[PDB]
Amino acid sequence: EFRPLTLPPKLSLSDFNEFIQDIIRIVGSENVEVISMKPTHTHDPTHVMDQDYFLASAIVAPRNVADVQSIVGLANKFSFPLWPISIGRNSGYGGAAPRVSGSVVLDMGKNMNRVLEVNVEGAYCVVEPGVTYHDLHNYLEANNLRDKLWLDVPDLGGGSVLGNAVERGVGYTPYGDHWMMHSGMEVVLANGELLRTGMGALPDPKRPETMGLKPEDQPWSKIAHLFPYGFGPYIDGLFSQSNMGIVTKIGIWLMPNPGGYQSYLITLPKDGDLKQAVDIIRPLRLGMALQNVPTIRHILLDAAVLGDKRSYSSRTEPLSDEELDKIAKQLNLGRWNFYGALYGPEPIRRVLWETIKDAFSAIPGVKFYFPEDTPENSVLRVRDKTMQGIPTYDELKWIDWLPNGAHLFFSPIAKVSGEDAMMQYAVTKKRCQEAGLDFIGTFTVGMREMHHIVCIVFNKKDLIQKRKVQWLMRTLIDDCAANGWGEYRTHLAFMDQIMETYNWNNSSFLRFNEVLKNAVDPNGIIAPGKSGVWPSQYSHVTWKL
Amino acid sequence: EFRPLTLPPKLSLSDFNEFIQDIIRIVGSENVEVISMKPTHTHDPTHVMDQDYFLASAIVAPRNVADVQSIVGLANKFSFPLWPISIGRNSGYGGAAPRVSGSVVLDMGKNMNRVLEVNVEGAYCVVEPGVTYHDLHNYLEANNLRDKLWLDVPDLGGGSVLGNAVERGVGYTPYGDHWMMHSGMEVVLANGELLRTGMGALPDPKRPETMGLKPEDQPWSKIAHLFPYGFGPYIDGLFSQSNMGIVTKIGIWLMPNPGGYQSYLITLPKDGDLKQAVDIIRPLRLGMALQNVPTIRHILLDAAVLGDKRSYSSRTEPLSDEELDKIAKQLNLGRWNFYGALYGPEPIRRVLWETIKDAFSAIPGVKFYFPEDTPENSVLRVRDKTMQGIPTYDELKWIDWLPNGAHLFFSPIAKVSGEDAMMQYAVTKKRCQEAGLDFIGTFTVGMREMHHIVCIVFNKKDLIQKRKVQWLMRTLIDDCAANGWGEYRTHLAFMDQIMETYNWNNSSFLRFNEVLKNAVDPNGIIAPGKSGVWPSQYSHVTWKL
Amino acid sequence: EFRPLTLPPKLSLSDFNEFIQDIIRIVGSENVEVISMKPTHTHDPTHVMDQDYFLASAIVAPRNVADVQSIVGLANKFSFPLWPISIGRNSGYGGAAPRVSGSVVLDMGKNMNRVLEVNVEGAYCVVEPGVTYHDLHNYLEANNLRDKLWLDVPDLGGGSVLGNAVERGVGYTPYGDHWMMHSGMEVVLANGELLRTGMGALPDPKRPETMGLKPEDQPWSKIAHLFPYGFGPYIDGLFSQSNMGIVTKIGIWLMPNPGGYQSYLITLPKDGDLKQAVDIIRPLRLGMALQNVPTIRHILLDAAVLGDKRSYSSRTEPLSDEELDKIAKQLNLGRWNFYGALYGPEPIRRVLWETIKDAFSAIPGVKFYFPEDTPENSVLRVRDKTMQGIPTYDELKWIDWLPNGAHLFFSPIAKVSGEDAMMQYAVTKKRCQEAGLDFIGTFTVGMREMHHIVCIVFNKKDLIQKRKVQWLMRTLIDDCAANGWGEYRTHLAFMDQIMETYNWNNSSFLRFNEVLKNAVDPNGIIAPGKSGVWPSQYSHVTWKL
């Protein structure tokens, strides 16, 4: 196709058309769309910034790994920035929009979709960009693996198993640290060469049956997916949250059925009980009584699953402290809410669960519930499935808090300390108030840290509110940095600002990242700007936000 | 000082003297030795290869981080190769010897020795190259932390905590994977700049009390040592087993007192019981009943702790199958021996321990022992301390199997499958026999993989056996690669050979590693040859073994 | 001389000795000191930071312009950084200390001292780095020019006329903006070539008498010092506050005797009268009734001229609001104090003076005084000489507020609005209080802006207070930048911080300045780091504060 709305930097319309005809000749016109449930792949959907920002020139869906290698070849020939996606469902981080306009979004999921291998004795699977969590689930159920191996799913199930893992997301089971469960990844580099990490570099020995296969299609050696380190430099991490390569395949470890499961809910009556609760959770997480990643939800998070804002009030301004208590009562929930789960034989569960209850009993008016003790529509019923690896679509109901809601995640990290968590909550709560927004968030409990997801929801068509959201977001980044907290992940417009936060010793961390990226991507064609890392041909003065 | 035995590549004697006076003027003459319990820092002690190989030109001991920076400056000025060590105690991997002769060994432990911080609520410590495991142990005992926080120690306690962790060593408690317990490292790069990884890049906010401190001496932000990922590319792994930078500081996560501990021994009668034992260990490790990294030791390993070869036989050739049985009997051990430990409240221990015993009960003649049930000198008494983080010097007795023994480790990885373990064991036992050596080894049980340490012991003054040792080693490397197994770590003379083994898709892995190294070390002065990775100014033709 | 405490970056001790013998052979040993009233030229005197910072390696005093050229030649040969000073008296901005250690301080005032020309019909003088204000004063008195031409002096008379003017200082007469009174500068560039700006580039026509003179010693054409622009790019400003060249000569415009002079003092009773006073000053300055640069001083500034802190109180903590009032009373001054002066025939003076008094009459309890109406020791008696171009040493008494006081200037710019002045004053007063220091300062009234000098005084030997001083300074810098105010000049340790504040559109300003500097100084030997501007061979990671 012929005339895009936006062309990549320095490229003519003629160059653009020559390229597209070349890609069209490789992957078929059906896998190449030019911009002149069903996630968009062309633009930021959770519009926060405006037009001209994050708009692709074309979407290209490779049929396979070779196609990715030919498309890289052509980006290097023509100097065309690529933006690689697996699914593009996470609006809030900007969905599939490219950081620089004119990029070709590389839809890896449309055709490279295969569950490559589910290995029972090793307790791992091997996956392509396109396998969503739902797909891996159906894959297990149709092969009888449901009662031998379990999954680990993020709050919504349509995300991509490999996508989520390379961006380092978190799940709610004992295997919740996705990135930490990977072993043996296949990558297409900026030069177009194929590379496999860890024991993935140790080739499967020759055998009659696997002779002549292209590299991509070759099997892996036996320890590829059982031991992540291989030998020498462990380079895997240069591929999480980076623009250093295009991830084509990845092995993720699966937790075998524990032969015992019980999910639960602990309600904390007062807004201020977060402090003692977090002090209670600390020793228990560090001492292993708490098996999975346990979450601490704010009342409106559960509230919004169950109903939009108009369904709880007419106010257009933020609900008050009073109303929040009334919503809590209405649903039988607390002001803050702890969800977690017990895994294993009954005899073990029991002891953990008597220790847990025992510890949270020191908070007045605390209340303990199993799924069964709660309403049909309850979050616990839904989360009962989430913490045993079963994927759902339920919790997506909160996105619709406001009418034409769009949301963004402000995601700082806090210590596992009541004092620290109350301090971080205060800073976010003031600012959310100052912007006219309800504060909505969760804390997901890591072993020695807490991931705090603040869900800023607003009206995608309101010029005034989007600017308040832009002002909120950048002010929270600074406030949080002035209190020694940093974000673990953000949307395309805050990458630069968040990377500037990690400036110890005059930006040593980013300088060093710059070196690695110009070395391996001399034309700077693999996602310029991802995480605020820019190749030399992209002037900081021109591109940073 | 004036005239070294060996000078670094292309450097004159005049250049060399100029440099050395410069370094002497920076760190004092007492910290600079020229080569013209108490580990050697000048040469490979476990002589395998011959003279001219792995011989330093000088040892240099920085007083602090500034001193490492100035020494890097002068290596880039003069083009002098540095070989950075922490302790240099691991003969068998080549102790502190440099891969290229003429290098200056950088002894980082002599002066940069401090336990920087032991934080209890966060359950981490922060350390300098010089803190040995014994040192961190005494640090805890002198501040009352012994009944709050425990360590994780490798079979010998004199190694370096950070050294062991960047090299990716393994311990025998639940926090056994050292590298995976790190968070927040300080690195001096080849350009001379200081760099802190993950949340170590997010600076501590300004305060009156920490103003004006040098970068090196600044505190870290609060999540520095609690969340390892930070934001963007996770680059940490580029510093493990690499020549990418000089590690100055590191934070390691400490496991709090579990309020319950029981160590144990399960003796396996027959040489062939390894196969069923490994099939039994598989589900139990994967289902979490086995809490620590359990070990499976061969009879001579325990034999050798207790006594030299002469003390069990006059024979000069390898002991036979029959004699091995007799030795087993003599000590009350099996042919293979499983060591492990139960952590936690009694109610929990008990259920794990009934599941463990139950499962190993299917192996005829199996026998279960607690420390107390065994002789004063037993290994289990020693290992009872090892599996609770208490360091010792006991197991070092085996190095003396033979008279003027030196040892080397042949270190392949196997599946956690009886079948695979028996196959690897066969390949290693034949080859050791063909070289006239006793087979001595362990398997340390990872979650989905086993680390197989074969301990090749020989006479360091015997020309004929050293060569058989070199022949064993390189044949094992190939044999193992022909069966799909790679090594996780080796001595200076096998580094090129083992890297060549990870050659999938025509050496992609090492090619990509060469790009990163030349980018960040344009003069190639940081440890040329580590892991088989060579900067461009070191001809492969000239330097590879 | 042989062995300095600190050597410039990358330079050997042998190189250093070679250079120094070369310079010694050019200017004589009496003009070259090696570091192994009477201002120091070797280190920061108003110690704030610590050792190793801002320490010269040698002081070099050229005999003349040729000598500066040869010294530039040798800095480019050896790559040695030069730090050019004129006088070095301004402790508080760091006196003559170099921004990078190992630099050679180039003392230009010791020998290049001459009053080159005082031209009456043109009403200008032409000067070398060494002419201090006292010196130009005595020059005028010895040639009868005292009743024809007047000077313009900064609060202390010992600074350098050209030095003060390239740094853009301010005086208290109608010709108060020093930099704006220059015309025709002679510069030695980093390549070593001599350059004369504006009509200084248009050469004096040949004549018998000026044939054969070196460039440096040639006369200037007739408009050289009467029209500053010349033709084409006006480049003059590249030499103010910059590291673009070494200023050798400069022409400054002198204001002829106005035939009428009356200096005065307007005392403002209350701490809050600053607000109405600044609103009163606004129209009057803008409408030209206020002839000179009037000043508005805080009570302790005048207090401190007259006596140390101990002489007003025993207190070690900051004096209170109440005590300030009592001090005001004791001296017959207000809380704030406005100094100014009427120039010109009596008929004109009188009308300005009735308009001035009239306007300030709306501030209750206001009091008007001429010199004669005040005590012998009063500030107005001193400032009566200051506002007619007569230099003094009097006001230097305040430096001794505290015992072993050192001071630093925090120098922001504010609008000429009572509201803005009170807001800036608040921000600075809180912070000084939080550091335990007395707030001391002035506002010097530009035509449409105010220069606010906050004088931070502290004990140069107190580790704890120096750090509070470093904390104050950097917090003030940010606070002020968060309120839209920038600093106009700072000490060596805040240069990077203050430049980072002028970062509109991702640091465009400094990026563009980096381009000009690398173009003209390819070896980066002219004052690396001045104003936060660093040549390419000075890693930002390594050198920024």
Ligand SMILES: Nc1ncnc2c1ncn2[C@@H]1O[C@H](COP(=O)(O)OP(=O)(O)O)[C@@H](O)[C@H]1O
């Ligand atoms: N296969 C891949 N290779 C490299 N980067 C990838 C790959 N897949 C995803 N990414 C990255 O992950 C980011 C998140 O996108 P995505 O895969 O669409 O999320 P999700 O599956 O959580 O909806 C993309 O912006 C891109 O940076």
Ligand SMILES: Nc1ncnc2c1ncn2[C@@H]1O[C@H](COP(=O)(O)OP(=O)(O)O)[C@@H](O)[C@H]1O
């Ligand atoms: N601080 C460090 N920075 C970089 N590499 C290091 C550092 N310390 C040790 N090493 C690496 O670790 C290897 C193992 O050495 P060493 O510390 O002496 O072992 P141990 O502590 O097991 O005795 C060295 O050869 C080098 O590869």
Ligand SMILES: Nc1ncnc2c1ncn2[C@@H]1O[C@H](COP(=O)(O)OP(=O)(O)O)[C@@H](O)[C@H]1O
């Ligand atoms: N001739 C000159 N050429 C270039 N820069 C100069 C020259 N003289 C002074 N400077 C600059 O002016 C700054 C102020 O120094 P100085 O002359 O010692 O101050 P003062 O006269 O106020 O005591 C120096 O640090 C340097 O930045």
